[model samples]
Target: KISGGSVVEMQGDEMTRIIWELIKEKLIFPYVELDLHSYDLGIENRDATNDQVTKDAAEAIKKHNVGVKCATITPDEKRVEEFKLKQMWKSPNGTIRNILGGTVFREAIICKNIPRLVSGWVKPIIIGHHAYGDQYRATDFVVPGPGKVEITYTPSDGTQKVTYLVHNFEEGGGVAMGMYNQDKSIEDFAHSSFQMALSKGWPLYLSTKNTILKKYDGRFKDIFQEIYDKQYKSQFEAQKIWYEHRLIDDMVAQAMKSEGGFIWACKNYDGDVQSDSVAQGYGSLGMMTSVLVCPDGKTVEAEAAHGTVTRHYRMYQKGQETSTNPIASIFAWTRGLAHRAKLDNNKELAFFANALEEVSIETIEAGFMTKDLAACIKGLPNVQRSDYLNTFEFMDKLGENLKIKLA
Candidate 1:
């Protein structure tokens, strides 16, 4: 009654790259019989190939419909010198996202013992951010004395054009901005978010600063509403879940106070800012997962929300004890495979996802956690080696736990 689907794996660089291998060996291979199409997008390989490999990998994920990626460095000046020679490369995630045309959904991993800054979030808050086009890729101008900024939207069919005066500066001379979005991108964001919420059986809430930027943000609200009314409304209502719009500020305050278990749809900038707040609220970045969902609701790519943990890697190089948490990396595999399982209707794959997720939480609940998390526990003494297992050992413990659960 169950069927397994393929996972196109893309490996990246740094500390997470090492954890990536352990995850496969200790967790994935032992449980699921996977059709794995593997590609190495390490920094050295990216440089040698002039980053063509990143493009190729994205295409592969598009074809396969599921991607599990390791945390890779988005290069900066120091990285350019450290790697020695090639030009600074763009973020692989950025490149892949551009090709796929999707929105990214981020969720925090919750454990009972790990103290969250916001005490109320007992369940997971999934943040679905529209990653395509907006402030992230916007142009701006500083009005000199008194100038106006206008945004014009020309329909792709070329039959209609709409323009809005974004701002007309008075003598004070501050800032004016203009932005635009295509019908296609917004449509996809709606479908992807609705599909994701439907998959989880969670209610979906779209947030916008419509009160201020009524027209600009209103477009987002109206688009989502249109999609929900026409396409997803019946299905969502049948599932006892619904979609609604919220003011940006109201949403943030509500999100902080509420117990989790809902999907929040955010425009580009809100997603960027609120994701960090959500991450911190839930505890550590070490336990957060990032996923990109295409507008078509078919493809997904998963990775840890944090960087490659270069500091831990540096310590490991010098034979110093390092406490790098691997929960997020482990969850990346599970989350990607879970979506793949859902797509393929594979019970075994879904069970594997559920099992691994439980093991991660159970492991933490058993009083084994990374130093970062241990530091957050109230009334507990400062954590040292005894408080948590080393990276490899902790993963091994998880593997052993998985076997027990499976048995």
Candidate 2:
């Protein structure tokens, strides 16, 4: 009965799955023993179980209140036959988000050594989208050569159907989509967003295209405003932070100009499109960490913002040396553990978590980075074998550095 707190450890795919184990083996299990409730969400396992495994893991994370996940593949048409899946399953993250009833909040894992295109951004420009609705969970149609689009409502009581013309294609090809967002999801989105800002001691900004889609985007703007006024206003004022609604364009412009700080509450569409732009500006997606926070803020799931490094995994599979970054994956565990530390009121766990993070940054800052990050410093033309550590060597270096740091 080793105790710090239990973590629902959801395993994933490719190189990240490999690093997931090494991270615990080196950084975590060595010092503080934890009760791990592990679940495999690998593509194979998920397909084998008909995606029940993903659901089970999400439920476990909800129950435990803390989960650390490794990045996995979301199958495509090719993958359908490649993996011989029953169906091309939707994103595991999407499935988990729906079950957990939460929005993802991503924060940049910044360090002094990391240079940025937006140098003014010194702190983490925390951002994520309200992922509940929009094109992600919508029905669309491709109209063939001049047709009519309409909205139809079928009465459950067996009354006459209500229909209204949406659009008429006069001559030819067109496309249409009908989408909806629930009030429940919006309320949850606002609470989780406000809670994230409140927890970080930063103000929150909810961006929208309220000017054009006044009803649709306006609802988001309104819900966030109401929540701030009724629930979080005093708490935010007490902490000297505030919440405001920003037009999406204006917000992006301001983000470009402002220094690194504060939380930007992006819409689902915006969050998806802007996620990588922010990453590129900040330096790398390798510098970002993700957390899915429930509306209550009590339950959380953490993971790396990047992919599984499948190319590196391919090399590793062939016994060739590879250099892959593990900072975000490592941060996934640290961030989740930090939350566990807070919940358990264990200062020892907190300090250990902080110490490990400190070592990670200093290790890279001291010029020991993988090829990916080393390229961020010295250009690819100049980066050498000795300039950076191979994939496993980098992990080994971090472990040794962290051991000395904790000592």
Candidate 3:
């Protein structure tokens, strides 16, 4: 394994796999001479190997310190039938995150003239979602009658245990829940978020429903605060950036009004819901990028926030004219490579990432965009064959722009 200028690439299932090849040939290989480590975690391969391929890919990422992924199907019943899989396997991301233990950060690319839910935002809001335990792994049930539900924390090191009644109800039937997390996972989340904020030179915030679940959510807030106060405080202050806790509702309100360019840390459930809102609020999922960062500040994996664009893939298979947006896919490569560049302290790699990002936005801002984006612009004409380039053509334009910028 090489030390620097190396990128571990993982190919995945579905339509984006096709786009991945185009990206490498047209964009990546032309500029950066990468020491590439590649793996194919395609659906058929995942089934054939019983999903060991995904794990090996993740371990390779950990070893090399950087990864760029294509969108893959998280198989459900239909997918199982379609692929004739032996059994429904878990999401590759879930498996990978469990092994790597990190926080997933999401950011939408903001472009001028795009209509956002909140029209005033001029910059990007980066969200760091703690992907560890919470509602995601919570034990839940529908209460049959009047009963009490309690959450208990039993320390593994034989420390004093604590339990609290999370909910007590007598009249109506609803839901009860129990959730748990070790000190380790929370610590990793904090470190990853702090690293992300520091790297971007942006302020950091952690949002929780502490006003309600004081004991549960409070644990997260306390851990983050303690880490910041003890370890990150000096560096944060020096950078003129800070960290604080806000009520979940207040955080959303502030996020809407405030100018972007800050990192917001969310609990698992809040992140699941809010990330979609944030992506839509930015005007297009076509422009959203997701990156997973581990606690060591070493491993990273980047991908588009959207799925495989199956509708367009099917049309293309039929030789029909299909307009698929490829902006997010391109950013996946740029962002992963950018982080790789930063880790290696290679200015040229970072410059390539920055150039590609600008070209994507510049192309769209020049009034050449896919049909989905054009529909959102009021009084804008519909996208035609001449108005916007197809997927491969658009990527070619971005590659051409990047080459020009680099020159």
Candidate 4:
């Protein structure tokens, strides 16, 4: 059972929004008495508030240090036209990340009973991306014609500043851009990565193309190495885990062959690309859980790696039975609570969060799963009604089993 704790709870949209409440009513509230700071971030709510609610929620999470978010809907065509908005709004999660100034790590849930496509992952690979800059936060301009591309860095401090000739558009230039990241941010990313690795007691491997882009990728490598040697080396060794740097290409090659229980420190762009291949290869993600860990490793926000089950939400709206997987959402709650447990140093809360995390896998292994996971186990040919549980029924089964575990 859980004792009293404070957590920022962000309610979301559609099917997940519906399941979010049920999860608490059955699984969370039944066991733990928590002080949840609630925020309504449904799409309609976002539209009405001009998305201020999102920023406010993010700030609250920052203050509280833990957030358990439901999967919220991204404005698709249906929402855009129905709401009759000026344009489709951005992801509330994205808005929150803008204010949070942290990195996100996605880890896939491992259930041996679930069919896996590739054996490259020796264990669960904790893939994290520095979502601060590179592509996501860059200044880009389309060059209509051939032009010289130069970037000027005028020093605000009374120091020398240099401008680099980025590229020369010989003929028919397409686009040119400038991107940057602060040393502090990279350090933060490093600290968070090392902290994540330490938390999991797993070796950390930072992947960067140092040879190709010495100064660019090299900074990431250098900062991580420096921090590890100066700050984290002893702790890592004590944990029996190490930190190392690998060229991006080399890391990919090795990772493809190695069994997958390592933490990867990836660039924002690299994460977006590499993780896609990694997920497809390791054959993971639906069971993926995401958490935002601040640079100092003090605060965290847990969310599903994926978005709202808009399709199933539509079906549910039509009064049809749907089997949307809530495992990731459920894990989000566990992650947020685990952070609270750590901050509050509540032993009982820790045990409760850890126990709840295992419940999803235990439920799946026991032949109770949502249709999505059932399909994942065997694809189209393998999934059957008998093999899966409905949206409501699946949660009911989870509640039924969790109570027994609590007992």
lDDT of each: 0.84, 0.85, 0.81, 0.82
Estimate, for each residue in 1-407, the C-alpha lDDT of model 3 and write its tens digit: 11338787878755688888888887778777888898777889889999999999889998988888888888889999988998877777767766777798898887786777776677778898987776555567788877787878799999989997878887877887677776889988888888888989899999999879887789889999999988999999899998989999899999989877799998877876788788877776787888888877678888887777788888788887755677888888888888887887887778778888888889789887776677567424654556656776676777777678778
lDDT of 3 at 8: 79
Cα lDDT of model 1 by residue, 1-407, tens digit: 22457888989878888889988888888667778888788898999999999999999998999999998887888999998939978778767877787898898887878888888888788888887777644566677777777778799997889997867776668776655667788878888889889999999999998889887789889999988899999999999998999998899999889988899999878887788789978888887888887766688898887888898999888888767789888888889989998988887888989999998899889987777788778424766667777887788888899989988
Ten contiguous residues minimizing lDDT sum, candidate 3: 378-387
Worst 10 residues of 4 by lDDT: 277-286
Clashing pairs in 3: none
Candidate with best TM-score = 2
**Higher-ranked by TM-score: 2 or 4:** 2
Q: Which pairs of residues collide in model 2?
A: 121-260
Residue 280 of model 2: what lDDT? 67
Residues 270-363 of candidate 2 have per-residue lDDT tens digits of 8766777787688777777788877766998998877888888989999998887888999898899999999999888888888888899899
RMSD of 2: 2.8
TM-score (C-alpha) between model 1 and the true structure: 0.82
TM-score of each: 0.82, 0.89, 0.82, 0.85
Point to the candidate with the largest lDDT: 2
Off by over 4 Å in 1: 1-5, 30-33, 135-180, 195-203, 211-215, 229-243, 342-347, 379-381
Ranking by TM-score: 2, 4, 3, 1
